[PDB]
Ligand binder design. Structure first.
Ligand code: CLA
Ligand code: CLA
Ligand code: CLA
Ligand code: CLA
Ligand code: CLA
Ligand code: CLA
Ligand code: CLA
Ligand SMILES: CCCCCCCCCCCCCCCCCC(=O)OC[C@H](CO[C@@H]1O[C@H](CO)[C@H](O)[C@H](O)[C@H]1O)OC(=O)CCCCCCCCCCCCCCCCC
Ligand SMILES: CC(=CC=C/C(C)=C/C=C/C=C(C)/C=C/C=C(C)/C=C/C1=C(C)CCCC1(C)C)/C=C/C1=C(C)CCCC1(C)C
Ligand SMILES: CC(=CC=C/C(C)=C/C=C/C=C(C)/C=C/C=C(C)/C=C/C1=C(C)CCCC1(C)C)/C=C/C1=C(C)CCCC1(C)C
Ligand code: SF4
Ligand code: SF4
Ligand code: SF4
Lengths: 65, 74, 138, 42, 81, 73, 74, 154, 56
């Protein structure tokens, strides 16, 4: 806590169910390393019975900002 | 005169469909999002959820409102 | 057959399994271990017993002979084992090969997962017209 | 016992005490004026 | 393609996730870093039929597979007999 | 287990009956089935519907030919 | 008499086309089937699960269309 | 007046309808109720469709051939409230069905776990957001298009 | 299920999303389970894995 970790993020890929909608996050990755970090989470479910997916900062367009 | 308006009404309807059906094949085998975009064939795709709705809103209205008038009448 | 009678997996009759197309083409068969004399469920509708030998029942087609597991592992046992019989020999060594239990690591074998480009924006439709000179045979 | 900023709940089909009734009072206007097809006003 | 339906996802972890599907899927082939580190989309698929039992469980987050294979053996449909 | 239908290939050695039906209804799908090139295709619809106009005159001919000797005129 | 049929030929090409417009307006894909392509047209069916998925190829909406082209044109 | 004929003040074809047809209603020379206290064709059912005489009110009402009455409503000669009068009425009633649709809804998505409060109903009909509709003077006709549902939220 | 077995309430179960297989009607909202609930309402693979009651 000091910058911004997981406090409000849209999705922008167009495949991901809650795509353009902004729900809440959690333990976003630490290290330099990989390409699929970030958990996100929101109320609304989706086409599977369980929906709580991980997208990745190449993108999260949050966008402003 | 009455088995000749229709073989030209069947067909004609029969077309239209096929018309509408080779312009949903363009979008898959051919078509090319990077080569068409901001471009008015796009936007047509892009601003699509409305397009079916302000279409479906015609039917549902044109639905029960014809059907009030015709049972009521019966 | 009889003059050679080598059995293992008890049954009696049945209009279920194996018929003409398991000679003229391929064969498929499952084998296993077991503790003490126990009555089972069966593919093809029927039902019999066990004890041993090879415990080597032969089966029509291989989706059929792994379902000994989709229940025949809700009835104890590490070991169950199905191969591929021809009308003459091998290549396709079916539960043979390396390790076993689909969910471990020795090697990687095949699979891949990607095509050219990955799941990303294939709003990009079908590209080139199919023409004998640009890497789309995979 | 109910004051200000929403109240107590109610069942699955209280709509069956809302189709039947309310709406039901309306036959009750469709015999007081046993007829329509335009209407005088007040 | 001849069995080409994509169930991929991103975790490709397979614990309380997915196993179901007659033979086809001998995976756990750990790619150099993807959390519970087991990945991809299949092994050698020239063996079994055309499920989507394939997802039904454990994510594909996009599509999920089904029939798309066309070129279709018989061993690849119960009935060659 | 032989090889047959002369254009597709997945279809061509499929041991069932699909072999048949699906033969007689991929015929006219030139764009992308084995035998095709943007050069092939086009022309392969061109001398196709020159096979058109063609069948429209064996229709019209006979239309004017069950009429001229009987069928009052 | 004509102020109805005339509104019920109008509820036809509308409904017929919400489905053709739709049929077309994503042979590309959508939420349930996002990546619905490289074959677009007639891939009829898909696996059970997701919500349960079916006649959701742009052909099977064409397929579905042809009933209202056979109900207007009537 | 317009395409069909004139109202009730005269409509021959219409008259014949009154008369045969209903009155055959009659049709039962007797059928026993000389004094008897049930079988009510007798009183009204006719007379309630009937004492509807050379009066029905008077309504104008155009009446074509066979003299069943047609509805123009083009706002002229007499016929205006055969659509608008009962038209704005349809508008006003609905819209205060869904003004509150967009209400015992936009009042929830908050506080603590609000995930189906709706299969039960918090205030029945809303009975709180209730009158918001008659308590629409102007309302959405401004505050819908400016602010709240504001293009922002668009 | 849960509130509040077993010995400790009379206090009846009116309020707390769901019941009927176990990542049940989930917190997370949906409609399908409203035809669920009526359909298969009577059934027995759920209620309890134990005869007993059902005939009761
Ligand atoms: C409900 C019908 C509607 C009506 C009222 C008509 C009426 C007519 N059609 Mg017709 N037609 C229609 C739909 C209709 N058609 C459709 C949908 C098609 C194409 C799919 C055709 C294709 C067609 C052809 C080629 C011809 C006609 C002809 C005619 C006239 C022949 C007299 C008759 O009794 O037809 C009654 C209607 C029917 C018997 C139902 C249509 C069933 C048949 C004609 C189609 C089956 C053949 C198939 C398309 C081709 C097989 C190829 C094979 C033989 C090698 C008549 C005006 C003939 C003509 O105009 O005079 C020269 C000419 O033969 N039609
Ligand atoms: C006027 C012309 C026109 C032209 C030039 C084409 C051309 C084409 N269409 Mg097409 N189409 C049209 C109108 C046309 N279409 C119309 C009007 C419709 C619906 C209204 C369609 C619906 C359609 C579909 C679904 C498809 C095509 C496809 C195609 C392509 C392959 C053709 C094929 O599959 O036939 C091969 C068919 C046969 C050899 C015969 C089997 C056909 C059956 C269904 C018989 C139909 C009814 C029949 C007359 C009844 C039996 C007769 C009875 C008397 C016994 C080709 C590009 C395919 C495609 O490539 O899209 C990706 C395919 O998807 N079309
Ligand atoms: C009592 C009468 C009769 C009956 C049984 C119905 C029944 C119905 N009408 Mg309807 N209607 C009637 C007379 C009737 N109407 C009359 C006289 C008119 C005016 C000519 C209308 C104009 C009308 C419209 C525009 C619509 C309906 C719709 C409907 C459907 C109900 C949706 C609804 O109201 O939910 C409760 C209301 C809501 C959930 C909110 C919807 C908001 C709507 C009412 C917006 C109004 C704007 C409209 C275009 C007016 C133009 C104003 C403009 C000049 C700025 C329903 C089956 C809708 C439909 O067809 O869908 C199937 C809608 O399209 N009606
Ligand atoms: C006679 C037929 C039956 C009926 C009533 C419908 C009705 C409808 N079809 Mg449909 N359809 C049918 C047969 C029917 N279809 C068949 C046989 C096929 C092909 C196999 C299709 C293929 C088809 C397609 C592809 C589509 C439709 C769509 C529609 C809807 C279009 C909107 C509309 O017309 O107004 C609305 C509806 C009506 C006027 C019908 C009455 C509905 C209300 C008034 C019910 C009455 C309430 C009653 C009092 C309460 C009773 C319920 C209970 C409590 C007892 C409508 C619901 C389209 C759609 O989804 O629109 C958005 C589109 O998807 N249909
Ligand atoms: C969808 C619409 C449609 C519309 C616009 C109407 C409109 C009307 N119907 Mg009606 N009706 C319909 C469908 C419709 N109906 C259907 C589908 C049925 C069959 C279930 C009926 C069965 C029916 C009956 C039995 C009656 C009506 C009556 C009426 C009139 C009474 C309304 C009233 O009392 O207002 C008064 C209050 C205000 C205007 C406020 C009104 C002109 C009544 C009538 O008297 O004949 C015209 C008669 O009771 N209707
Ligand atoms: C108006 C149309 C007519 C025309 C011009 C053609 C023309 C053609 N057909 Mg064809 N066909 C037709 C009606 C027609 N067909 C019908 C009614 C059927 C059965 C429903 C077929 C079933 C058929 C098959 C299976 C094949 C063709 C093929 C062909 C092409 C090869 C030439 C040939 O077969 O001799 C040629 C473009 C062949 C082809 O084009 O392969 C790519 C192929 O073998 N056709
Ligand atoms: C959407 C659709 C697309 C479009 C743009 C059209 C357009 C048309 N169709 Mg049509 N049609 C379609 C799909 C479409 N169709 C499909 C899928 C079918 C399957 C059956 C048909 C079957 C069909 C038939 C049988 C006929 C038509 C006819 C017509 C024409 C009648 C014009 C009219 O209704 O004025 C009505 C009067 C007006 C004043 C229209 C004003 C509406 C304005 C407000 C447009 C607002 C739109 C925003 C019109 C050019 C008719 C025709 O061409 O000859 C008369 C008739 O033949 N269609
Ligand atoms: C009055 C008579 C006329 C009216 C009768 C109604 C006919 C109008 C129907 C609407 C048009 C659809 C028919 C198109 C042909 C069938 C579907 C099709 O496209 O074929 C082929 C399509 C294939 O569909 C696509 O094919 C591509 C490759 O060609 C892709 O690889 C995929 O397979 C798929 O996307 O669907 C079929 O599989 C057809 C099989 C049907 C076999 C029946 C043979 C009987 C022929 C009729 C003989 C008389
Ligand atoms: C001129 C006109 C018109 C019109 C109208 C119109 C003008 C109409 C149109 C129509 C068209 C159409 C209806 C079309 C359709 C189609 C489509 C829409 C398509 C689509 C698609 C798809 C699906 C995708 C892509 C591809 C395509 C494009 C194919 C008229 C005129 C007139 C009148 C009447 C009045 C009086 C005067 C006059 C002068 C006499
Ligand atoms: C107010 C009102 C009303 C009403 C009534 C109403 C208001 C009705 C409505 C109803 C509704 C409905 C009936 C709906 C339905 C729905 C549906 C039908 C759907 C379907 C679907 C879906 C869900 C989606 C898609 C799919 C499907 C199609 C399945 C009115 C009143 C009146 C009258 C009497 C007359 C005159 C005028 C007035 C005076 C004004
Ligand atoms: S998404 Fe499916 S099978 Fe794919 S990686 Fe996970 S569980 Fe493995
Ligand atoms: S999904 Fe496909 S590959 Fe997987 S099991 Fe089913 S058929 Fe086999
Ligand atoms: S459900 Fe649909 S898809 Fe699934 S099997 Fe049946 S048909 Fe096929």
């Amino acid at each position: 806590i000091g910058p911004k970790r997981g406090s409000k993020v849209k999705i922008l890929r167009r495949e991901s169910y809650w795509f353009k909608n902004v729900g809440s996050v959690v333990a976003v990755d630490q290290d330099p390393k990989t390409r699929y970090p970030v958990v996100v989470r929101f109320a609304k479910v989706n086409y599977a019975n369980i929906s709580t997916n991980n997208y990745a900062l190449d993108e999260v367009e949050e966008v402003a900002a | 005169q009455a088995a000749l308006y229709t073989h030209h009404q069947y067909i004609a309807g029969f077309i239209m469909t096929g018309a509408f059906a080779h312009g949903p094949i363009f979008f898959i085998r051919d078509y090319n999002p990077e080569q068409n975009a901001d471009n008015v064939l796009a936007r047509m795709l892009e601003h699509k959820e409305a397009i079916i709705s302000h279409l479906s809103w015609a039917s549902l209205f044109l639905g029960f409102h014809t059907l009030g008038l015709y049972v009521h009448n019966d | 057959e009889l003059d050679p009678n080598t059995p293992s997996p008890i049954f009696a009759g049945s209009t279920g399994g194996l018929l003409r197309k398991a000679q003229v083409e391929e064969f498929y068969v499952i084998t296993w271990e077991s503790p003490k004399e126990q009555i089972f469920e069966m593919p093809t509708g029927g039902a019999a017993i066990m004890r041993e030998g090879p415990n080597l029942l032969k089966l029509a087609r291989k989706e059929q002979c792994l379902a000994l597991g989709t229940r025949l592992r809700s009835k104890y046992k590490i070991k169950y084992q199905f191969y591929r019989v021809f009308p003459s020999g091998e290549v396709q060594y079916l539960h043979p090969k390396d390790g076993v239990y689909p969910e471990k690591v020795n090697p990687g074998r095949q699979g891949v997962g990607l095509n050219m480009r990955s799941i990303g924006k294939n709003v990009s439709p079908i590209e080139v017209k199919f023409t004998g000179k640009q890497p789309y045979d995979l | 016992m109910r004051d200000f900023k929403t109240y107590l709940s109610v069942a699955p089909v209280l709509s069956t005490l809302w189709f039947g009734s309310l709406a039901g009072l309306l036959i009750e206007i469709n015999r007081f004026f046993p007829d329509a097809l335009t209407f005088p006003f007040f | 393609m001849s069995h080409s339906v994509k169930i991929y996802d991103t975790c490709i972890g397979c614990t309380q996730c997915v196993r179901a599907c007659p033979t086809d899927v001998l995976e756990m082939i750990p790619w150099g870093g993807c959390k519970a580190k087991q990945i991809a989309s299949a092994p050698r698929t020239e063996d079994c039929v055309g499920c989507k039992r394939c997802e039904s469980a454990c994510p594909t987050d996009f599509l999920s597979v089904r029939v798309y294979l066309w070129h279709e053996t018989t061993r690849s449909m119960g009935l060659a007999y | 287990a032989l090889r047959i239908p002369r254009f597709s290939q997945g279809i061509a050695q499929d041991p069932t009956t699909r072999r048949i039906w699906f033969g007689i209804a991929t015929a006219h799908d030139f764009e992308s089935h084995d035998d095709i090139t943007e050069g092939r295709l086009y022309q392969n619809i061109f001398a196709s519907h020159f096979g058109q106009l063609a069948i429209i005159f064996l229709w019209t001919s006979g239309n004017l030919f069950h009429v001229a000797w009987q069928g009052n005129f | 008499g004509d102020f109805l049929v005339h509104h019920a030929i109008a509820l036809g090409l509308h409904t017929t086309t919400l489905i053709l417009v739709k049929g077309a307006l994503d042979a590309r894909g959508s939420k349930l089937m996002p990546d619905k392509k490289d074959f677009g047209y007639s891939f009829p069916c898909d696996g059970p699960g997701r919500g349960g998925t079916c006649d959701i190829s742009a052909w099977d909406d064409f397929y579905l269309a042809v009933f209202w082209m056979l109900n207007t044109i009537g | 007046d317009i395409a069909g004929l004139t109202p009730c003040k005269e409509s021959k074809q219409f008259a014949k309808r009154e008369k045969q047809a209903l009155k055959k209603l009659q049709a039962s020379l007797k059928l026993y109720a000389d004094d008897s206290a049930p079988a009510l064709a007798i009183k009204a059912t006719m007379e309630k469709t009937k004492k509807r005489f050379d009066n029905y009110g008077k309504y104008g009402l155009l009446c074509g051939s066979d003299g069943l009455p047609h509805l123009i409503v083009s706002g002229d000669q007499r016929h205006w409230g055969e659509f608008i009068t009962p038209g704005i009425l349809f508008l006003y009633i609905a819209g205060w069905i869904g003004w509150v649709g967009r209400s015992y809804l936009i009042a929830i998505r908050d506080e603590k776990k609000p995930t189906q409060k709706e299969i039960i109903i918090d205030v029945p009909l809303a009975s709180s957001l209730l009158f918001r509709g008659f308590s629409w003077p102007v309302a959405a006709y401004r505050e819908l298009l400016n602010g709240e549902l504001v293009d922002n939220n668009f | 299920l849960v509130d509040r077995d077993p010995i400790k309430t009379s206090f009846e179960q009116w309020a707390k999303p769901g019941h009927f297989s176990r990542t049940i009607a989930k917190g997370p909202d949906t409609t399908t389970w409203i035809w669920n609930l009526h359909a298969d309402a009577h059934d027995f693979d759920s209620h309890t894995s134990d005869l007993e009651e059902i005939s009761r």
